[PDB]
Design a protein around this ligand. Sequence first.
Ligand SMILES: [Fe+2]
Ligand SMILES: [Fe+2]
Lengths: 275, 274, 292, 292
Amino acid sequence: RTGIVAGALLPGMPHLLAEHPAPSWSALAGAARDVGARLRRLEPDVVLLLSTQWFTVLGHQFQCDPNPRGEHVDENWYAYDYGLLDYDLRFDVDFTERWADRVQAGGMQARRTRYDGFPIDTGTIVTSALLDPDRRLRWAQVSCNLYADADTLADVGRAGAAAARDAGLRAAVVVVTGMSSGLIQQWIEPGQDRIGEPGHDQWNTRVLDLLTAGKVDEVLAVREDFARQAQADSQFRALAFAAGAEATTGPAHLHAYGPIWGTGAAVLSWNLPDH
Amino acid sequence: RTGIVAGALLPGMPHLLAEHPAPSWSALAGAARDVGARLRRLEPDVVLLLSTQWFTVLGHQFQCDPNPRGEHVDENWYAYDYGLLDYDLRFDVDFTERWADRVQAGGMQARRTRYDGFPIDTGTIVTSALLDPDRRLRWAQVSCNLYADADTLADVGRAGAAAARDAGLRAAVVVVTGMSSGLIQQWIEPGQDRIGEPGHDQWNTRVLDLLTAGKVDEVLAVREDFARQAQADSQFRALAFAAGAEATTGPAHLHAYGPIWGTGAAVLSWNLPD
Amino acid sequence: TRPGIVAGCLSPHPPHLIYGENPPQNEPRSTGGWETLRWAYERLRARIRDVHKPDVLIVHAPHWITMVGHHVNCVPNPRGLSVEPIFPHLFRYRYDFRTDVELGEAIAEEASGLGLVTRTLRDPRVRVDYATIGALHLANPAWDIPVVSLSANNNPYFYSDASLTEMEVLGEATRLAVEATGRRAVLLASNSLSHLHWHEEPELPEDMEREHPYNNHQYRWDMKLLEAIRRGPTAPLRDLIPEHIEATASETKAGSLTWMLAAMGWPKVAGDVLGYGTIIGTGNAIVEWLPE
Amino acid sequence: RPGIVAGCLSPHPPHLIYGENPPQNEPRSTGGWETLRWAYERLRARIRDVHKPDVLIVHAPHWITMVGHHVNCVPNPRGLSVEPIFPHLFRYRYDFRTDVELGEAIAEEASGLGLVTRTLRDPRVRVDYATIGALHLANPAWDIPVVSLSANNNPYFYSDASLTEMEVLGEATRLAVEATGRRAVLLASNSLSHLHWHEEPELPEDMEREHPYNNHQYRWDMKLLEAIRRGPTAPLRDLIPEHIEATASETKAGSLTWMLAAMGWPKVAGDVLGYGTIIGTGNAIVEWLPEG
Ligand SMILES: [Fe+2]
Ligand SMILES: [Fe+2]
């Protein structure tokens, strides 16, 4: 089959790679690694990618450096072992060109990004380490515009799925996002993690129940509520992008759910069986 | 017959009212009074008016004060008897409103002007004194925009003629403008007045010949050359306004031509007999 | 030396600046606007009031266009109502100030002695022009400093670039008079820079979303002139002013800037650009020059 | 006399560095935003020639620390700072020295006052583009020790920073400056109204396309600035949140509050060195001095 054929959603905080992880971090990390094995078994030509931690407020930026690599010390977690992250990413910059072109054809400002020293976000590095330790996948990444409407990001998602079809690619979509963002303002130990604020846990589970039942358009109808009351990562526009990219079809398989330093975190997949 | 039925062009410099004028100033002044008597005989309901000395650079301003009056001392000729000027002007502000609405409907910025102390330009004051000493005419006046194209003023004139016809008015058009503007930059005596620069006198007579021959178009075609080479008052856009108002039809009658402190000046009329 | 002219200023006069301030003398009222330029003028006001402390403000502005030579307002106490004919909704200013008649008479005398065609205006019935009033209000809204208002030689029927050479003569005439009479004077050259503007006024005049450079070409040329003002001496401005006029239709074509710099002796100094901003698209800079 | 000798509102949009074409910045411009850059030149001279501080303490919004307030105690931060949203405008090679002792004292005082804090000592962490931009604009010679403070906020759900915690951090900063005998200048690097173009003009520095986002944002900026240039700073305590609610001001990051709190809310006016817009956002350069 051509086009977008699989989808996955996973958290992106570096705690998933901790040497001494909280039980929830190791469960989320293990689920992510499982999703990665399934994704690589699908053998997609390209994986469209959006991580909330590469954000923008001006147009839609696309990663056009074919091979960013190096070491990244996260600006927040430098003091922990999981704050030091190595990365070596391969981007299909030519499919990215087709996708950026489709976005410009839709009236949006597509911005090619190829600069030495351009910052690489922690979410993308963590996702590569969990889903693709051997760097087999070829990514196509767009920024997460926080300024324009969430539906414009859905439009960019629709443009990506159309480009994948025009290019004859077997592609998947991966979005790196948290759920509720109730961060614990303390230097906690791994054993004392928890959902951070009242009502956040119920909100995450409500959203997760709807997605596991294939009721995606109903999470999108309540997205703004989820964002306001549970401080969902980037107003959960990562889901709007994934839905736009035809990636969230059918029932969602919940692989794991738990807290990361107060935030809500879940590993989900669409159309990613074990076989 | 309704609409614009007559037209006239006269100079606006206060030298026409001098107690001790050069022969040219007096001839032009008498020519202006002549046109005035012909105009008032025509008994127009309203006279559309453009004076180069009420200029603007922003939209098109319309005189909406029904009765400006007072005494005005010209900022240039205050030292001479003709620098002191009294005026009492009556504007038909309701027709002016219709005219302004038509200009606004045409996509142009029509700006209604009614303010205490608004300056009244010397050209309009001199014109009223010569054409209408008993203040019996009712004027409708628009500014002379110098910044927009000259053809936008032709559109304003066309709108004024259309408004006069719609209102059923018998109207005339008067434009107050100099010709060449090669002013003598010296405090001369009346007897030594002369066209200021070379080519200005020849350029003036050239357009007058065409106008008297009813060739207003060929004047408009060379208007920019006239403006550049003879420094025609406001690029002679006052003629573009009158032509747009359909007031310059048929042969022009040349009542007088002569210099005023170096500039060229002429009194002309269209369809004003007797 | 310690010249009589203790400072010379480029002091633009667009009525929008007075309108935005809502001074008591101005009938129309705004909701603000052009704040940064008004704040810059407040800085210049304090420089005149608190530092220069001049005996007289000598102003040259373009709109009193006198078609025969140069005129000097020698009316002892000019008063009246000044209505901006193009922006009457913005500027209807009731003025009342005192003239340094002796200095005005000396300036005209020195000017005629240098070969300029001159005249002294003595008729109090003549209305002071809206640009002179605007410039003076912005430089000193207290009106508690004697004034000498100078007119602008130009053609009111075919406006052209003023003879900049003649304005240098008027500057020397002004310098000679200030020195001869022992006056301590601040000069006000009231010209804007790039002078292409909107053909249509926004519905709210002070809607600052609609206030920006006419185009980047006009802006870049203003910047070229201002950067030269901020670094090198003033004498090179003699050659740059005409080029900037040809490129932008600058109001400096009136010659007021040239007049002031020449009156200061083309001092080998930089100009302090207190502020720059646009007014209906035109470039406007408030600048202070000091003696060497 | 207080150890903090001046506090500044010092916005950091990359356009201002881009327009200056400094050697450290890789991209090259044809200019732009000149009036704001000239205002910064004025601030630079004030810092260099008058205040003469032992250290520059900077708080900026883009080093977002999700847990508490961090202090950069890296002795010699170096690296390449690429602005992710405007990488065509700002790719800055930086190298400066940290006043480690002061930074450690600030962290110690802040924790003593009840804030969650951390001291960064890993030189591999890249300094954020806003901190670099602010420091360049205040002192492009980089010859004054620095203490860089992070901005407590949520990077996954950006919100109005806790202005109360910022007041605490400000007191912590004052205590540390006094305890260590330092003479400091503070840099609160926030823009004002923060709604901006969603499309960049073809030429970034096309100043025709530079103007307020809308008049509502402009007038609210003017209301804040008028209060700044007139009354004491204590009323700003309530005006700042009000202005944030109406304009989405970048002061919601809390840096302005932090600095004013560090200065003890002095009963003084702020000197507005300049205001202008950058892609529609309001940007003011302001200097506050201690009472007396
Ligand atoms: Fe002017
Ligand atoms: Fe910022």
